[PDB]
């Protein structure tokens, strides 16, 4: 089994991940979040993807209210958060990068996203089209997916 993780970053650069004991983070409105996707591996032929990322207002994933930030593979701004994608310039299909903006309050952060191999089994999300078009009602569906979460929330404050 590979195995999944979300983490936070001080900045762009991303040097090193913040730790637990750093959170909770504090972060302004419009500033951004700077976010990885990571598989701990040794395999060069696999490349993560994202599938959806979202935040509640509680740790629970599965608890509402949610804010949609990352739908199906692509940024949603629907619930007014942007999402910039950073890709890399070795193994750069091991992780995924991006920072997320926000337009006192407390944000717990999750996504979900998995590992493809260049098969024709591949996920759909494997090779994605942005902007993603909104689903029907039967267009709902689930990947095979680990869902990940910051070992921490974030507290938003009013710049």
Same mark, same amino acid.
């Given at each position: 089994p590979l195995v999944l993780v979300l983490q936070t970053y001080p900045?762009? /650069?991303?040097?090193r991940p913040y730790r637990?004991?750093?959170?909770?983070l504090v972060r302004y409105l419009r500033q951004p979040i700077y976010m990885e996707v990571k598989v701990l591996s040794n395999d060069p032929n696999i490349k993560l993807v994202l599938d959806d990322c979202w935040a509640t /207002?509680?740790?629970?994933?599965? /608890?509402?209210?949610q804010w949609q930030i990352v739908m199906d593979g692509c940024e949603y701004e629907l619930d007014n958060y942007r999402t910039t994608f950073h890709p890399a310039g070795a193994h750069s299909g091991h992780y995924q990068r991006f920072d997320v903006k926000t337009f006192s309050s407390l944000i717990y952060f999750h996504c979900s996203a998995l590992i493809c191999?260049?098969? /024709?089994?591949?996920?759909?999300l494997c090779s994605v089209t942005c902007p993603a078009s909104l689903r029907s009602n039967a267009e709902a569906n689930k990947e095979d997916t680990m869902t990940v979460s910051l070992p921490g929330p974030i507290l938003l404050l009013s710049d």
């Open positions: 900045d762009q /650069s991303y040097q637990k004991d750093e959170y909770p /207002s509680s740790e629970d994933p599965a /608890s509402a209210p191999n260049q098969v /024709s089994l591949d996920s759909p």
